[PDB]
């Protein structure tokens, strides 16, 4: 059939010219059913065609087509644990998205893809159903129904072939877990390939760190229950006999550094092979080469094994590359944080020989800063340069402002409330501004803190603090007196050795006192300041303002911040008032804690703690009573009521503010009081010395699988507090509180573990040596924040 005209109907997205090019047939030529079929096939192969029907009009060749309907929108339902936006991202990555045509043949394909994603994320019984709703103008809407079902959990992690170590102990270090006690925060019970690989690597490292050089993993198996709700993990290993390190040999282009290197490889002949030690040696060699200038010092160690004598001979291959140089250091993604804050954290100065270790340290510091969710590194090559490279850091900004709330309970502070708002990055400048407020049984605290971590690029930090403090003594089982104070402080920070830290600063504090019960010790200071309050009444007041020069030193070496096993912590805080201030006194404190493990695994550790405090006036005055050190509680000496150790108050005869019948009073004038009065209420002292020797052992009864999360310790605590300005001769009848010989001792058991409701600590103590008036408290615990 000769064709004189060509017409189409339904062409919406495909241009008429493009379709005309597509169909082989053209106007002005004979056409047959074969050519019509070929054109229809080509149109359908175009991919944008749904219903093709070539039609011959009276003379024209008319074409009609619905075409593949366009996807107007995508809807989701049932994705409880899967987020809609990321699911849509996955769909568009697969190809299906808004604006594109919907293929009426792949519905099962998208369903199976989504089910595969569910399997990957953990759910294995997930079923995905798609509903298609036709719409006018060849528009279509698709709705996906998700039945997430349940996610299978690991029911067991079995290891076969192990004889040297128990399977529970081996799993103790695994990221994956099979038991999740409700009273322990150990983790979830999900399964992931990355977690399995990490667990395998951890097991291999553990075995290699004990002389089992020939350790090998034959294979692993993963099995599911018929219900597809339980997961079983099995690992088969073959632990060989232990081995000894005969010696170490090195060879390579050391670049004339052989003499220095040998000192790093020295070992004691007849030791146990240790992969960790080998890795440390390799890292030390790499660091030395980097110090020498080389940027990519490849180092390899291939042990040589002699089974006849069970000896291992390390063979170290050293390869030092070429000395590269860094031309530029660029940062991308810091749309908020300025360039300087990122740059000052770098350890590879621009325009110097490159160092991989330095770059990694800089990346680690940037990650530690916490302002960035993700940090990436790249080392590009400058165009046409054999030794010049550009270091580029890619970062993703992370929100810094964080509202914070906290609740805690304890036998010392009772009910505690913590609430504050913190901003670590103020307008992307590194300044840390935050407001915090603390409330407890016997004090209310609120402060505003502003600090610049880098006052000088060397690392000096400038602080700043404004605080309002309210203190009630009666609620703190001390002599009744109320102290409301407020002031501001500014301090500096001097990092000198990456473990020590010196800090000095000035501070102004105004103290207001009211509702004070008369007592000899307190009135000593009050008279020393020239005040002459009345004895018969407690409606006394006293206001003061002081400027003090604050200084302190810190030393941190603990291996781990939680459950430390080795290291030492020493703190020394000292403050003294400067002239002009009403008060004239100096206070010095010294805290110390030492951990010494006596076992290779560091399970058994001896812990020793000490605490020293002293102070006194300068210009014939006395240290203010409200700054006295307090002893007793769960922090200084267990088994004693909080702030109960030390000199006890001596009350003068006075009339009660509001006498009440059948009401306990401290021998008021309405109770036949005609002379000085003894009591059993602590008042603190100007000198304190607390020493605590603690012995740590593994928990015996808890399952070894997760027993490492609970710390059990036997402690023997001793402390003492006394006053250095107590006139014993003047008051002979009452006990001499100026003699420090009255040492207090106690002992007991202590427990500690991480709990879903915050940290938990328990301690049962039986004080065996106490003096008159001391109040005992065997049971003590603190659900801290």
């Amino acid at each position: 059939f000769v064709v004189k005209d060509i017409h189409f109907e339904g062409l919406q997205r495909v241009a008429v010219g493009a379709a005309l090019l597509s169909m082989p047939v053209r106007t002005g030529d004979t056409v047959n059913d074969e050519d019509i079929s070929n054109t229809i096939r080509a149109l359908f192969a175009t991919g944008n065609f749904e219903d093709v029907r070539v039609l011959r009009d009276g003379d024209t060749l008319l074409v009609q087509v619905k075409e593949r309907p366009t996807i107007a929108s995508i809807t989701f339902s049932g994705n409880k644990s899967v987020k809609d936006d990321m699911l849509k991202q996955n769909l568009e990555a697969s190809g299906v998205r808004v604006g594109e045509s919907l293929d009426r043949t792949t519905i099962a394909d998208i369903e199976k893809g989504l089910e595969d994603f569910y399997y990957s994320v953990g759910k294995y019984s997930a079923s995905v159903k798609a509903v298609v709703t036709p719409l006018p103008r060849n528009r279509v809407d698709l709705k996906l129904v998700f039945q997430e079902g349940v996610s299978a959990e690991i029911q067991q992690i079995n290891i076969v072939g192990n004889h040297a170590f128990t399977t529970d102990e081996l799993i103790s270090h695994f990221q994956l877990r099979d038991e999740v006690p409700w009273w322990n925060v150990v983790g979830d019970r999900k399964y992931q390939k990355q977690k399995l690989a990490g667990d395998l690597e951890t097991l291999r490292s553990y075995y290699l760190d004990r002389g089992y050089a020939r350790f090998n993993i034959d294979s692993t198996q993963v099995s599911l229950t018929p219900d597809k709700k339980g997961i079983y993990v099995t690992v088969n290993i073959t632990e060989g006999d232990q081995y000894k390190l005969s010696g170490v040999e090195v060879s390579g282009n050391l670049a004339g550094h052989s003499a220095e290197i040998e000192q790093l490889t020295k070992i004691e002949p007849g030791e146990l092979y240790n992969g960790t030690k080998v890795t440390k040696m390799e890292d030390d060699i790499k660091k030395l080469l980097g110090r020498y200038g080389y940027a990519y010092p490849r180092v390899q160690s291939m042990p040589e094994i002699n089974d006849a004598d069970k000896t291992v001979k390390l063979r170290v291959n050293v390869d030092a590359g070429n000395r590269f140089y860094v031309r530029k250091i660029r940062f991308e993604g810091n749309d908020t944080s300025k360039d300087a804050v990122l740059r000052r954290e770098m350890r590879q100065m621009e325009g110097a020989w490159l160092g991989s270790d330095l770059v990694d340290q800089g990346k680690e510091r940037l990650n530690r800063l916490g302002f960035f969710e993700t940090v990436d590194t790249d080392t590009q090559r400058v165009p046409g340069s054999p030794d010049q490279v550009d270091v580029v850091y890619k970062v993703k900004e992370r929100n810094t402002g964080s509202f914070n709330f906290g609740i805690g309970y304890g036998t010392e502070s009772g009910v505690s409330f913590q609430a504050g708002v913190q901003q670590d990055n103020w307008l992307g400048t590194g300044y840390a501004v935050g407001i915090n407020g603390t409330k407890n049984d016997y004090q209310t605290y609120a402060e505003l803190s502003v600090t610049n971590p880098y006052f000088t690029v060397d690392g000096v930090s400038l602080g700043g603090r404004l605080f309002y403090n309210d203190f009630q003594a009666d609620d703190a089982d001390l002599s009744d007196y109320t102290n409301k104070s407020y002031g501001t402080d500014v301090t500096l920070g001097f990092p000198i050795n990456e473990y020590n830290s010196l800090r000095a600063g000035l501070g102004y504090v105004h103290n207001s006192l009211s509702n004070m019960q008369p007592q000899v010790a307190m009135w000593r200071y009050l008279y020393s300041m020239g005040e002459h309050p009345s004895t018969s009444d407690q409606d006394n007041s006293f206001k003061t303002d002081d400027f003090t020069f604050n200084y302190g030193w810190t030393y941190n070496k603990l291996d781990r911040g939680y459950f430390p096993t080795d290291g030492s912590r020493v703190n020394l805080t000292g403050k003294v008032t400067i002239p002009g201030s009403d008060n004239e006194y100096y206070k010095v404190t010294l805290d110390t804690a030492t951990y010494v493990p006596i076992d290779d695994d560091h399970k058994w550790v001896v812990l020793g703690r000490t605490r020293w405090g002293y102070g006194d006036g300068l210009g014939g005055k006395e240290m203010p009573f409200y700054e006295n050190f307090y002893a007793g509680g769960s922090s200084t000496v267990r088994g004693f009521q909080s702030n109960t150790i030390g000199p006890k108050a001596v009350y003068f005869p006075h009339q009660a503010s509001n006498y009440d019948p059948d009401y306990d009073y401290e021998c008021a004038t309405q109770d036949g009081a005609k002379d000085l009065c003894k009591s059993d209420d602590a008042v603190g002292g100007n000198a304190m010395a607390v020493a605590s020797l603690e012995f740590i052992t593994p928990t015996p009864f808890i399952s070894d699988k997760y027993a490492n999360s609970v710390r059990t310790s036997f402690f023997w605590d001793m402390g003492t507090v006394w006053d250095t300005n107590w006139d014993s001769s003047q008051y002979s009848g009452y006990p001499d509180y100026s003699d420090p010989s009255n040492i207090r001792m106690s002992a007991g058991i202590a427990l500690q573990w991480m709990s879903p409701l915050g940290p938990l600590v328990f301690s049962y103590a039986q004080p065996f040596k106490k003096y008159d008036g001391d109040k005992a408290e065997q049971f003590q615990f603190n659900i801290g924040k």
């Binding site: 929100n399 402002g401 914070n404 709330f405 906290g406």
Partner: peptide, 7 residues
């Protein structure tokens, strides 16, 4: 217990 809510 201690809650934090980044804003």
């Amino acid at each position: 217990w201690n809650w934090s809510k980044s804003f």
